[PDB]
Amino acid sequence: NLENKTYVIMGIANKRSIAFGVAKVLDQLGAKLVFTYRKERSRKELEKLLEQLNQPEAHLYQIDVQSDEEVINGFEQIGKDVGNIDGVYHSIAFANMEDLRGRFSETSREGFLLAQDISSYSLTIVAHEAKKLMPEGGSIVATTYLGGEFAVQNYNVMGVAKASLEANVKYLALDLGPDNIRVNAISAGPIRTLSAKGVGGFNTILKEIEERAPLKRNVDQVEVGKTAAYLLSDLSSGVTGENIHVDSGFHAIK
Amino acid sequence: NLENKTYVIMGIANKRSIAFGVAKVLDQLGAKLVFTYRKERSRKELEKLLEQLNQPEAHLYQIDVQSDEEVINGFEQIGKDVGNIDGVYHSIAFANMEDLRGRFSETSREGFLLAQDISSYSLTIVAHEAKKLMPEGGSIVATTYLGGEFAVQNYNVMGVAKASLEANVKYLALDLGPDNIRVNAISAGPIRTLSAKGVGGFNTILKEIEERAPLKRNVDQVEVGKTAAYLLSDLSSGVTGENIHVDSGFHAIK
Amino acid sequence: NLENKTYVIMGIANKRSIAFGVAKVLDQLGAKLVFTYRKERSRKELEKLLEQLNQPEAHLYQIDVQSDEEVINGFEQIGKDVGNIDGVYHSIAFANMEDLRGRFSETSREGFLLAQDISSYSLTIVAHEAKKLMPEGGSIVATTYLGGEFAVQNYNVMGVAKASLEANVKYLALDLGPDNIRVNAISAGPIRTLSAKGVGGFNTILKEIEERAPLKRNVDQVEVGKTAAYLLSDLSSGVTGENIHVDSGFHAIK
Amino acid sequence: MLNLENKTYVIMGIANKRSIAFGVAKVLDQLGAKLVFTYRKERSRKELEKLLEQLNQPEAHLYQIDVQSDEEVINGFEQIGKDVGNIDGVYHSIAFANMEDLRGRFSETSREGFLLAQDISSYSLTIVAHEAKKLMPEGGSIVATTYLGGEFAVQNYNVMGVAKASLEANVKYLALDLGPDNIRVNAISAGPIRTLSAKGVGGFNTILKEIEERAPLKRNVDQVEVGKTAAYLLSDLSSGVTGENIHVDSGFHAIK
Ligand SMILES: NC(=O)c1ccc[n+]([C@@H]2O[C@H](COP(=O)([O-])OP(=O)(O)OC[C@H]3O[C@@H](n4cnc5c(N)ncnc54)[C@H](OP(=O)(O)O)[C@@H]3O)[C@@H](O)[C@H]2O)c1
Ligand SMILES: NC(=O)c1ccc[n+]([C@@H]2O[C@H](COP(=O)([O-])OP(=O)(O)OC[C@H]3O[C@@H](n4cnc5c(N)ncnc54)[C@H](OP(=O)(O)O)[C@@H]3O)[C@@H](O)[C@H]2O)c1
Ligand SMILES: NC(=O)c1ccc[n+]([C@@H]2O[C@H](COP(=O)([O-])OP(=O)(O)OC[C@H]3O[C@@H](n4cnc5c(N)ncnc54)[C@H](OP(=O)(O)O)[C@@H]3O)[C@@H](O)[C@H]2O)c1
Ligand SMILES: NC(=O)c1ccc[n+]([C@@H]2O[C@H](COP(=O)([O-])OP(=O)(O)OC[C@H]3O[C@@H](n4cnc5c(N)ncnc54)[C@H](OP(=O)(O)O)[C@@H]3O)[C@@H](O)[C@H]2O)c1
Ligand SMILES: Oc1cc(Cl)ccc1Oc1ccc(Cl)cc1Cl
Ligand SMILES: Oc1cc(Cl)ccc1Oc1ccc(Cl)cc1Cl
Ligand SMILES: Oc1cc(Cl)ccc1Oc1ccc(Cl)cc1Cl
Ligand SMILES: Oc1cc(Cl)ccc1Oc1ccc(Cl)cc1Cl
């Protein structure tokens, strides 16, 4: 399947991060990987995590997506360091924790814009710069949640950033299609991760999946990873602009 | 139908503005109205336009939705001036002209955020402040475009702002529902307005409607205005979180 | 609003029928009406119900939509009897009760086809014959349920029939658009009616609305009736091919 | 990882070498699966035997099944059981309507045209699933083929559009019902491809070009491209995925 393919994975914080599910799958399929992190506070973290994978050597780059400069210099560095790439997995979002609770109508302007900034626009420059490393096409995948298509009870501002992300995926598919670059999203069902703790009611969400979703069980990081392997490889060559729900069928019921 | 109801209408620039179609319809149905504008450069403009309507007196307020302060002071002023209101029609959007062309992947961070700011978040504070003037419920309506649900060819950043606006409507419906405030959107088809001139290829868009759309003709401001009257009145009491296409059936075909 | 307009209303069984909410609304707006029923077992029923409305005289026609002949002769008779019409409200569906429970995978071929036949195809001949009584355009509205967009837990075959109904509305809107005939659907939220008793778990459905729906309450026949008045009148002239949820916003949350 | 040895799938609706189900067949066959083929007519039986020389099945597995007949679907799948043991998936690639319903005013379509289309293109999935379930003790995966015309009114698809809308719901309702038995039900919304049935759909040429001109990838897809997504849907790569409708259509479904 995937020898000699190269992918940049963005947004591993620890062993439970969705991007680490993706990482493990692609690593198993023999790909080489490039990891980006926000903070040093998870850098030495990552080095430990990497002992678990079989990279011939480490590729770790600090990228805070709030900074145009870091994304540009980051991707230029990846260029000089590994050569051309075949894909990017975007696993990045954020919002202020007090926005992710209380009345959505109460959310501040800066809260709103901050969420859009990190969870949605980041995909955009990321794509633009990644494009530079993809002469003969490639594949970009971002992670969303159902809360981007429907109002969910504690997701508020992040819901609005997901709706924004989803459209961003469509508009980038259209724009980067002629360069043979496919842009897709995976709408994951709830998984227990570090960021999951910011979302209120997350426990009762977890249980509604088990009770009402068709498969009657929750998904996990490895499951999201296997769909990312599909989206990033040539198995999905006909596929762009799409939003694939890895959520035990929850999106289909009501 | 609508005597003694009061509605704020936001975003009339001239006689061709969509919000002026809404204005005319509600004015005919005997409502009293409150108008908000961005610039003095369209204030004396508005006074002329109002001569066409039958308001017993003028209610005009400068509100730039980029400024928290102006929205708050604006709606407090309305409170003191007219008393409680029954609805708000939001007809506001903006993006940088050079973002509305060229590759979407080339758009700047500030372009992106500016568009989200005005076209999407503004609904949020608007709602929050309007809620203060709506003790026993009411109805809020914003205007969107199909470009929010699908990638269209020159809409780019505004597309991503519309996707965001539509989710904003959903999240606001959920939050304000218990206070008996309904939040809905109208996805208008292309209409020749002042802002329409920013959107590239607008002519061929206009014709695709005439050619491919079920009704085989374009809509107009008054036709948007008539649905607005429905969304804002008790006729739609069961209806919230909804997106009603006033677009000659274009949304339904492919 | 609606003096001298004429509409055919199809599928009143008793005072709790959705079509009777529509009836009451349009009758109040001063329209004249034409009623169609399946069984004599609800004919004298209807005569009683009509005492509640202010029709200058009775217009009652037996139409079983399973029979091509009855729909044709029915609508020809209406023509000779009242002249040309302005709309049709379709409120008809049926499936075998043992299909509306048990595994959906167990449903019989005849069960499936019967449900499609009455709940979906009926709209088609109805439109075709109606069109004959609509020289200068008009408006057709059918009734659907969310179960047509998502798998709901006891709806089974009727869900597949609604998905079918929804697409039939779209394809008719496209076909009858040039003759200025608008085709639309209303996706009602659960209401306690005679047919409602066939759908299992209906009670817990009713309560999920009150609990999780934005408006935090159930809708009723008169509420559906007021949206029908909008779809059928010139207020919705720009509107066709559309599905308007009258369901307290339940369709927008998840 | 590696992939699909010793998996067994029933492929339904190969008419000739251009049939979509033959793209699926070629992909799965390449991934080392064993296959079972079902056909409507003898008129395409000896057809199939020829096509199979192209694949590497250790032996032939061919079963006549007309989905209009409850009996043939039941006896067909019981025969598959006795013949090859338990299966892992089913690829459904079957639809039909009367040719004169695929043109003209949709409003003019006959009752029987309507019901016939539902019957073959939609309901068939249901009994197929019901019977297939009997050969899937520890779960499996069912995939059916649709078209965008199921979601939006397209200009010549008429009655088939209403059958696809019905097909898509059927997948959702089956996912819900068969989920607890570990059986996933999904669809692939293919973009236009030149096949035998394609010739019944009017305007098919200008459809083909709108894809090349307006679709993000600016080119048409093919059977092998549909086949590779089917491989994903049928394998454990998609374990988290049911009730879903995956567009293999160069991104056309996302633009407007
Ligand atoms: N967990 C779920 O059930 C779930 C469900 C649906 C969608 N998702 C999506 O999956 C993605 C990641 O979620 P997760 O569960 O993997 O959570 P996670 O383990 O907390 O990963 C979040 C990552 O975001 C990074 N990050 C946040 N802001 C950043 C910025 N400005 N620049 C660079 N990196 C930044 C974090 O680094 P730091 O730790 O240093 O902040 C962390 O690596 C997000 O897009 C999220 O919305 C998760
Ligand atoms: N025209 C179409 O075919 C079409 C189609 C779909 C949706 N829409 C939507 O319709 C709405 C209105 O557009 P229109 O076509 O009627 O154009 P328009 O006549 O130019 O009206 C747009 C209004 O938005 C205002 N605006 C921009 N920034 C503002 C701010 N910061 N504060 C207050 N007002 C601000 C403009 O004010 P100033 O000019 O005074 O600065 C103007 O009054 C928008 O939401 C647009 O997305 C239009
Ligand atoms: N009740 C709800 O909560 C709900 C929610 C969403 C959507 N809906 C929809 O709203 C519509 C109206 O249903 P309802 O709730 O008002 O039920 P209802 O009061 O019992 O009305 C159903 C009507 O359909 C008629 N019908 C069934 N098969 C027919 C046939 N072959 N020919 C002519 N008429 C036939 C019945 O006729 P006779 O009884 O006179 O024989 C009856 O008048 C239905 O399409 C239903 O799917 C209902
Ligand atoms: N081609 C496209 O661009 C396109 C696009 C979207 C969706 N699709 C879908 O693709 C699927 C497959 O058709 P195709 O276009 O690939 O070419 P095809 O092989 O010509 O498809 C027709 C298949 O249907 C089978 N069939 C019809 N009725 C049957 C019955 N009652 N019992 C058993 N088999 C029956 C036919 O078998 P016999 O003819 O041998 O009897 C034939 O093999 C269809 O479901 C279609 O809706 C195609
Ligand atoms: O998108 C998500 C959806 C779910 Cl159900 C759970 C976690 C998610 O991820 C986040 C949620 C909130 C914040 Cl502030 C940051 C992140 Cl990464
Ligand atoms: O959203 C729109 C969609 C269309 Cl088809 C036509 C006009 C539109 O309205 C705008 C477009 C661009 C900017 Cl900057 C501002 C506005 Cl109000
Ligand atoms: O569509 C419906 C949805 C709901 Cl919640 C309740 C009733 C409905 O309508 C019916 C459902 C099944 C049958 Cl046999 C007949 C009818 Cl009239
Ligand atoms: O549905 C389709 C859509 C397209 Cl664009 C091309 C082929 C299709 O397939 C069919 C269409 C009509 C009939 Cl009667 C039978 C089949 Cl197999």
* CB contact burial D123-158 (16+ within 10 A = b; e otherwise): bbbbbbbbbbbebbeebbbbbbbbbbbbbbbbbbbb
Residues of A in contact with B125 (CB under 8 A): 109
Question: Ligand 2 mean position to B167 CA, how many Å?
Answer: 19
Q: Which residue has the tokens 């008009």?
A: C138
Name which of B121, B131, B163 is nearest A167 (Cβ-Cβ): B163
Name every chain A residue with its beta carbon within 8 A of the beta carbon of D176: 214, 249, 252-253
A87 lines ligand 5 (CB under 6 A): no
Chain-chain contact of D154 with B254 (C-beta, under 8 angstroms): yes
Q: Tell me if residue B155 is catalytic.
A: yes
For the CA of D164, the nearest atom of ligand 4: 47
Give the distance (Å) from ligand 3 centre to CA of residue C157. 15
Q: Minimal CA–CA distance to D172: which of A250, C112, C190?
A: A250
Q: Which two tokens stand for residue C29?
A: 């707006």
How far does CA D166 lie from the centroid of its chain?
A: 14
Instruction: Give phi and psi for C171, each to the nearest 5.
Output: -65, -30
Longest Cα pair distance anywhere in chain B, in angstroms? 50
- Of A114, A178, A115, A170, the closest CA to residue A142 belongs to A170
Nearest atom (ligand 2) to Cα of B205: 3
Q: How far apart are the first and last CA of chain B?
A: 37
Q: Which ranges of chain C would DSSP assign to H, the alpha helix? A: 18-28, 43-50, 68-82, 109-116, 122-131, 156-176, 202-212, 221-232
Gapped junctions in chain B, after residues (C–N > 2.5 Å): none
CA distance D82 to D104: 46
Q: Which pair of structure tokens corresponds to residue B168?
A: 């904003």
Give the three-class secondary structure for C94.
coil
Of B89, B99, B112, B158, the one to substitute when testing ligand 6's pocket (max ligand atoms within 8 A of C-beta) is: B158
Query: What is d(CA D103, CA B152) in angstroms, rounded to the nearest whole number?
Result: 29
Give the whole-angstrom CA distance, residue A182 versus residue A139.
Answer: 5
**Partners of residue A253 in chain C, C-beta under 8 Å:** 150-153
Q: Which amino acid type is present at position B187?
A: S
In contact, D132 and D87? CB cutoff 8 Å? yes
D25 CB contacts (<8 Å, ≥6 apart)? D11, D14, D35, D37, D55, D227
Q: Which atom of ligand 3 is nearest to the CA of C16?
A: 19
Q: Are strands A181-188 and C243-246 parallel, antiparallel or unpaired?
A: unpaired
C112 vs C89: CA distance, rounded Å: 24
Yes or no: say if B173 and B141 are a contact pair by the CB < 8 Å rule. no
Residue B94, ligand 6, Cβ within 6 A: yes
Tell me whether strands A60-62 and C60-62 are parallel, antiparallel or unpaired.
unpaired
Interhelix angle C156-176/C122-131, nearest 10 degrees: 20
Q: Which ligand is nearest to the CA of B247?
A: 2
Closest CA to A183 of B187, B160, D29, B76: B160
Q: Please count the CA atoms within 13 angstroms of the CA of C49 that sit on its side-chain side.
A: 21
Distance CA C42, CA C13 (A): 6
User: Measured between CA atoms, how close is B157 to chain A, in angstroms?
Assistant: 9
DSSP for chain B, written as a single string: --TT-EEEEE---STTSHHHHHHHHHHHTT-EEEEEES-GGGHHHHHHHHTTS--SS--EEE--TT-HHHHHHHHHHHHHHH---SEEEE------TTTSSS-GGG--HHHHHHHHIIIIIHHHHHHHHHHTT-TT-EEEEEEEEGGGTSB-TTTHHHHHHHHHHHHHHHHHHHHHTTTTEEEEEEEEPP---TGGGGSTTHHHHHHHHHHHSTT-S---HHHHHHHHHHHHSGGGTT--S-EEEESTTGGGB-
CA–CA dist B174, B167 (Å, integer): 11
Phi first, then psi: what are they for B90, rounded to 5°? -90, 120
Kindly report the nearest CA distance between residue B125 and chain A, in angstroms: 7
Please name each of the domains of chain B with its CATH number: 1-254 (3.40.50.720)
Catalytic residue list of C:
145, 155
Burial B85-116 (b: 16+ CB within 10 A, else e): bbbbbbbbbbbeeebbeeebbebbbebbbbbb
Integer Cα distance of A41 and A20 in angstroms: 17
Method used to solve the structure: X-ray
Residue with tokens 């109508």: A105
The contacts of residue C120 (CB under 8 Å, 6+ apart) are C161, C162, C164, C165, C168, D114, D162
Report d(CA C89, CA C11) in Å as an integer. 9
Q: Which of B152, B153, B253 is nearest residue D152 as measured by Cβ atoms?
A: B253
What's the token pair of residue A233? 């490889």
Specify whether the CB–CB gap between C7 and C86 falls below 8 A: yes
Give me the sheet containing A181-188, strands edge to edge.
Answer: A60-62, A32-37, A6-10, A87-90, A138-145, A181-188, A243-246
Ligand 1 mutation pick, A41, A91, A203, max ligand atoms within 8 A of CB: A91
Distance CA B49, CA C139 (A): 34
Q: For chain A, which chains pass the contact test of at least 3 CB pairs under 8 Å?
A: B, C, D
Task: Tell me the C-alpha distance between D169 and C150, whole Å.
Answer: 7
Q: Is the CB of B250 under 6 A from ligand 6?
A: no
In this structure, the number of other CB atoms found within 10 A of the CB of residue C70 comes to: 17
Exposed/middle/buried for residue A165 (C-beta within 10 Å: 0-12, 13-18, 19+): buried
Residue A207 exposed, middle or buried by CB count within 10 Å (0-12, 13-18, 19+): exposed
Q: Are A229 and D237 in contact (CB under 8 A)?
A: yes
d(CA D121, CA D109): 16
Q: Ligand 6 in contact with B158 (CB < 6 A)?
A: yes
Token pair, residue A180, equals 């043979």
DSSP string, chain D: ----TT-EEEEE---STT-HHHHHHHHHHHTT-EEEEEES-GGGHHHHHHHHTTS--SS--EEE--TT-HHHHHHHHHHHHHHH---SEEEE------TTTSSS-GGG--HHHHHHHHIIIIIHHHHHHHHHGGG-TT-EEEEEEEEGGGTSB-TTTHHHHHHHHHHHHHHHHHHHHHGGGTEEEEEEEEPP---TGGGGSTTHHHHHHHHHHHSTT-S---HHHHHHHHHHHHSGGGTT--S-EEEESTTGGGB-
- Please tell me the distance from the alpha carbon of residue B115 to that of residue A245, in angstroms, as a whole number: 28
Terminal CA-CA length for chain C: 37
Residue C244 is nearest to which of B223, B237, B239, comparing CB atoms?
Answer: B239
State how far residue C218 is from chain D, nearest Cα, in angstroms: 25
Q: How far is the C-alpha of D121 from the C-alpha of D101, rounded, in Å?
A: 14
Among the listed residues D169, D168, A149, the one whose alpha carbon sits nearest the alpha carbon of residue C155: D169
A140 min Cα distance to partner chain B (Å): 13
User: Which of C147, C181, C141 has its CA nearest to residue D169?
Assistant: C147
Using the CB atoms, write b or e for C224-236: b if 16+ within 10 Å.
Answer: bbbbbbbbbbebb
Cβ B191 under 6 angstroms from ligand 6: no
Q: Residue written as tokens 């319903």?
A: D101
Task: Chain C: list its partners (3+ Cβ pairs within 8 Å).
Answer: A, B, D
Dist CA B87 CA A183 (whole Å): 40
Q: Give first-to-last CA distance, chain A, whole Å.
A: 37
Alpha helices in chain A (DSSP H): 18-28, 43-50, 68-82, 109-116, 122-130, 156-176, 202-212, 221-232
Q: Give the side-chain half-sphere CA count within 13 A for D86.
A: 10
CB contact at 8 A, A93 and A161: yes
Cα–Cα distance measured from residue A91 to residue C111, given in angstroms and rounded to the nearest whole number: 46
C-alpha count within 13 angstroms, C-beta hemisphere, residue B232: 32
Residues of C in contact with A153 (CB under 8 A): 253
Q: What is the resolution of this structure in A?
A: 2.8
C-beta atoms surrounding B156 within 10 Å: 29
Cα angle A112-A117-A119, degrees, rounded to a multiple of 5: 95
Cα separation of D42 and A41, whole Å?
69
- Measured over the CA atoms of residue A13, residue A14, residue A16 and residue A19, the dihedral's sign is positive
Whose Cα sits closest to atom 1 in ligand 4? Answer: D193
- The ligand 3 atom nearest the CA atom of C118: 31
Interface residues of C toward D, Cβ cutoff 8 Å, are 68, 103-107, 109, 112-113, 116-117, 120-121, 124-125, 127-128, 131, 148, 150-151, 153, 156, 159-160, 162-164, 166-168, 170-176, 241
Instruction: Return the closest-CA partner of residue A123 out of A178, A61, A186, A179.
Output: A186
User: One-letter amino acid identity for B201?
Assistant: G
- Closest ligand 2 atom to B143 CA: 45
The CB-side HSE value for C235 (13 A sphere, CA atoms) comes to 24
**Euclidean distance between CA atoms B236 and B234, whole angstroms:** 5
Q: Which residue's CA lies nearest to atom 8 of ligand 5?
A: A196
Where b means 16+ CB within 10 Å and e means fewer, B228-247 reads bbbbbbebbbbbbbbbbbbb
Provide CB contacts within 8 A for A200, sequence distance 6+. Answer: A100, A101, A153, A154
Q: Does ligand 6 come within 6 angstroms of the Cβ of B199?
A: yes
User: Are D154 and B253 within 8 A, CB to CB?
Assistant: yes
Helix C122-131 vs helix C68-82: crossing angle, to nearest 10:
30
Of C180, C230, C249, which has the smallest distance from its Cβ to B241's Cβ? C249
| Chain B interface residues (partner D, CB cutoff 8 A) | 146-147, 149-153, 214, 252-254
* Lookup: tokens for B225: 């205005």
What is the C-alpha separation between A75 and A131, in angstroms, rounded?
10
Residue B66's beta-bridge partner residues? none
Distance CA B3, CA B1 (A): 7
The separation between the first and the last C-alpha atoms of chain D, rounded to the nearest angstrom, is: 38
B127 CA to chain A: closest CA distance, Å? 7
Residue B168 CA to chain centroid, in angstroms?
13
CA distance A91 to C244: 35
Instruction: Give partners of B (≥3 CB pairs < 8 A).
Output: A, C, D
